[PDB]
Amino acid sequence: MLEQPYLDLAKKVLDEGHFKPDRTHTGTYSIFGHQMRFDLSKGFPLLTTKKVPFGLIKSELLWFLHGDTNIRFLLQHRNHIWDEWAFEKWVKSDEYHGPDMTDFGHRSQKDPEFAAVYHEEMAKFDDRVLHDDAFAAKYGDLGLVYGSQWRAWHTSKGDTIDQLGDVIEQIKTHPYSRRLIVSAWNPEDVPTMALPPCHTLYQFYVNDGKLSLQLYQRSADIFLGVPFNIASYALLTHLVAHECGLEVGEFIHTFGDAHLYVNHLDQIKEQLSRTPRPAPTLQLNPDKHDIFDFDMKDIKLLNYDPYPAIKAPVAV
Amino acid sequence: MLEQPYLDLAKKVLDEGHFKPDRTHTGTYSIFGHQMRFDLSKGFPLLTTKKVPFGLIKSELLWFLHGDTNIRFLLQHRNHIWDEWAFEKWVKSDEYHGPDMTDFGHRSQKDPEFAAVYHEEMAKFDDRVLHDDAFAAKYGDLGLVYGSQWRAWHTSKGDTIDQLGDVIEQIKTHPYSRRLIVSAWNPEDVPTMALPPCHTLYQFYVNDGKLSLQLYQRSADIFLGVPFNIASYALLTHLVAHECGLEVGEFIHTFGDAHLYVNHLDQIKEQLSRTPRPAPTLQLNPDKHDIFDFDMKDIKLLNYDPYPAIKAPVAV
Numbered sequence: 001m002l003e004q005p006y007l008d009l010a011k012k013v014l015d016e017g018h019f020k021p022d023r024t025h026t027g028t029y030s031i032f033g034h035q036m037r038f039d040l041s042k043g044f045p046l047l048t049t050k051k052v053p054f055g056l057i058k059s060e061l062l063w064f065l066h067g068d069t070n071i072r073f074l075l076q077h078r079n080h081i082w083d084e085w086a087f088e089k090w091v092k093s094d095e096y097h098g099p100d101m102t103d104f105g106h107r108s109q110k111d112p113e114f115a116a117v118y119h120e121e122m123a124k125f126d127d128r129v130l131h132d133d134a135f136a137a138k139y140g141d142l143g144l145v146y147g148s149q150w151r152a153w154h155t156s157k158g159d160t161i162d163q164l165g166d167v168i169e170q171i172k173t174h175p176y177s178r179r180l181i182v183s184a185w186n187p188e189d190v191p192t193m194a195l196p197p198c199h200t201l202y203q204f205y206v207n208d209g210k211l212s213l214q215l216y217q218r219s220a221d222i223f224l225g226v227p228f229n230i231a232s233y234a235l236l237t238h239l240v241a242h243e244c245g246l247e248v249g250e251f252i253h254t255f256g257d258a259h260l261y262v263n264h265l266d267q268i269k270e271q272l273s274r275t276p277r278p279a280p281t282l283q284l285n286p287d288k289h290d291i292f293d294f295d296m297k298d299i300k301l302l303n304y305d306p307y308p309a310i311k312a313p314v315a316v
Numbered sequence: 317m318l319e320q321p322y323l324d325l326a327k328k329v330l331d332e333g334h335f336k337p338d339r340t341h342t343g344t345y346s347i348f349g350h351q352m353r354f355d356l357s358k359g360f361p362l363l364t365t366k367k368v369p370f371g372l373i374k375s376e377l378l379w380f381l382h383g384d385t386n387i388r389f390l391l392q393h394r395n396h397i398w399d400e401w402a403f404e405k406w407v408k409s410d411e412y413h414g415p416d417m418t419d420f421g422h423r424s425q426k427d428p429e430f431a432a433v434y435h436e437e438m439a440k441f442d443d444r445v446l447h448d449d450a451f452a453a454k455y456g457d458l459g460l461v462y463g464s465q466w467r468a469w470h471t472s473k474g475d476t477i478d479q480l481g482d483v484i485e486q487i488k489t490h491p492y493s494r495r496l497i498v499s500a501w502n503p504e505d506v507p508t509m510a511l512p513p514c515h516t517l518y519q520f521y522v523n524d525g526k527l528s529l530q531l532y533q534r535s536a537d538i539f540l541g542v543p544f545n546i547a548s549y550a551l552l553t554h555l556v557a558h559e560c561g562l563e564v565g566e567f568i569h570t571f572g573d574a575h576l577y578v579n580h581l582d583q584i585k586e587q588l589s590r591t592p593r594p595a596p597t598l599q600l601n602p603d604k605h606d607i608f609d610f611d612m613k614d615i616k617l618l619n620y621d622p623y624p625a626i627k628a629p630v631a632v
């Protein structure tokens with residue numbers, strides 16, 4: 001079925017992956033190197049075995065394709081996947097000066113001073129960001145995220161180059177070139193970053209009709225993480241596709257450290273337990289055509305029914 | 317045998333690849349997306365079915381690992397793989413002022429004004445570069461090649477960062493991180509380049525012992541091109557490996573547009589015609605240890621016997 005490369009790669013981390021420490025000491029079963037393929041005209045690649053959210057992914061990528069680096073658009077839509085490095089700056093600031101938020105992050109689940117205070121301090125940081133039009137700019141604006149990596153990579157001699165703007169040109173004009181890449185690894189910025197980009201590079205292809213794309217995620221979390229990432233670039237591939245004029249072909253997901261978490265063992269065993277129901281259908285607003293102008297309403301999802309959702313505990 | 321992922325990928329471009337125009341209109345059988353694996357302790361990954369040259373690759377990578385961007389070291393060793401963009405600058409210069417070299421490049425094979433003149437003008441450009449210590453600097457010095465991409469990526473605010481220097485540190489100190497990348501795609505520089513890097517990104521891994529590496533070549537020529545590239549990074553992997561203290565594990569070669577040339581059809585049919593003799597053994601100078609100090613003599617090749625070499629006509 002369309003989603004069986006994810007399953008065949010989760011039962012491959014699980015019993016074939018070796019135990020890696022990793023950074024936040026909770027161990028992995030790593031493997032290094034995996035290409036999995038998805039042909040997108042059979043249907044759309046998110047999982048029917050385990051509920052994955054589609055308005056979140058939509059709003060997020062939609063957010064990355066405006067080059068917008070501000071959570072205030074994300075909050076407006078109801079997305080807060082990005083919240084915690086923002087707060088990492090707010091509660092480490094000069095203005096924070098209140099009720100201690102040090103390490104909020106994994107003192108949570110460990111209750112004590114942390115379950116309702118780190119959480120009261122979050123709706124306090126958000127709301128401020130949705131309204132104070134300056135609070136929004138000092139802390140809610142992330143600087144280096146995929147919208148600036150993507151559409152305003154800062155040059156060595158003083159300004160903004162929109163990569164994806166030009167690549168959507170080079171597909172529109174020179175379809176068949178082996179240079180159609182957008183890159184997120186910039187090393188000025190790598191040594192001093194929160195999380196360096198995890199979807200490091202990606203290259204489009206024009207088969208004859210049919211745009212394809214290959215990603216190089218460098219680091220991948222299986223169970224949590226890789227359901228999400230397979231769909232963002234299946235949407236990117238799907239959205240660039242509709243703007244060049246071309247049919248959709250296929251998305252290749254290539255990984256470096258693909259690893260399942262040691263929390264996520266039982267939950268991934270639970271998932272494999274089940275059968276793929278038929279892959280979902282996505283349609284796109286055909287009257288809009290410039291993709292960077294896509295209101296939310298313009299990307300759609302024709303019958304999706306997963307199972308059950310699943311709890312993995314708190315990643316990082 | 318160790319080299320069968322290259323064969324299984326040449327009979328896969330050939331009759332499974334589709335006809336791509338490409339840029340220099342001589343057509344391809346492209347495919348998009350291929351991971352092939354090489355475990356380097358079984359032996360070394362260059363081909364015994366078709367003579368591939370090892371002092372060229374050595375001298376070249378050795379050249380890239382000094383961050384040296386000057387052909388004058390390459391010539392000194394006897395390597396001229398790099399010559400033609402150099403001349404692309406010399407014969408397009410202000411100083412050229414002689415006997416017309418316009419398009420040397422594929423007016424060659426087409427004889428006429430071009431077989432001994434573009435070629436007399438090459439030994440004239442080289443020799444000058446080996447001796448005039450200034451000629452060497454105005455035209456023999458390439459600026460942007462893998463030694464500056466690798467070890468002096470120019471920053472956005474005024475200077476040189478040695479990527480590979482720091483990654484050999486981060487392996488030496490934090491072995492198990494999913495960030496061990498060196499990147500060659502810099503977009504300031506991409507729109508105005510001769511050939512943008514073809515081996516775009518690469519990431520190391522520390523399995524438990526055993527350094528591994530994954531490449532992302534973006535564009536790959538099969539028959540000519542991919543015998544060479546599989547060995548350069550099997551040497552890089554092999555050389556970084558000996559400096560961290562770690563055993564050698566495996567090299568993953570990942571491609572985007574892997575394509576066989578329409579010239580190279582009969583010659584690749586000819587190649588497949590034969591049987592793998594046993595994979596070669598490489599040893600390294602164990603008393604030297606800092607890799608950036610490796611004289612040529614320090615990397616070695618224990619029995620290699622290919623077949624026959626093969627002629628593919630003039631690529632580009």
Ligand SMILES: Nc1nc(=O)c2c([nH]1)N=C[C@@H]1CN(c3ccc(C(=O)N[C@@H](CCC(=O)O)C(=O)O)cc3)CN21
Nearest residue numbers: 081195196197198199223224225226227228310311312
């Ligand atoms: N450097 C970095 N790169 C990424 O791949 C990435 C990142 N961080 N983290 C923030 C964003 C948005 N992405 C994310 C991040 C987290 C989830 C997430 O929480 N999804 C889990 C479910 C977790 C749960 O059970 O609550 C999943 O199953 O995929 C999804 C997408 C990637 N992006």
Ligand SMILES: Nc1nc(=O)c2c([nH]1)N=C[C@@H]1CN(c3ccc(C(=O)N[C@@H](CCC(=O)O)C(=O)O)cc3)CN21
Nearest residue numbers: 397511512513514515539540541542543544626627628
């Ligand atoms: N942008 C770019 N990236 C590369 O992969 C690359 C490049 N150009 N071309 C120059 C260097 C050095 N490399 C090269 C270039 C050409 C040959 C070459 O001439 N080798 C052919 C044999 C050609 C013949 O039959 O004379 C082969 O079989 O591999 C080898 C390595 C890659 N490097």
Ligand SMILES: O=c1ccn([C@@H]2C[C@H](O)[C@@H](COP(=O)(O)O)O2)c(=O)[nH]1
Nearest residue numbers: 023198219220221225226493494495
């Ligand atoms: O939404 C995301 C965020 C992160 N990662 C991963 C996997 C690791 O848990 C995490 C950290 O790895 P490094 O920072 O060491 O690269 O990055 C994903 O797959 N998807």
Ligand SMILES: O=c1ccn([C@@H]2C[C@H](O)[C@@H](COP(=O)(O)O)O2)c(=O)[nH]1
Nearest residue numbers: 177178179339514535536537541542
């Ligand atoms: O030594 C090399 C040099 C180039 N290439 C390739 C394959 C193509 O023939 C060439 C040009 O592709 P683009 O410039 O369109 O990327 O790059 C290799 O595989 N190895």
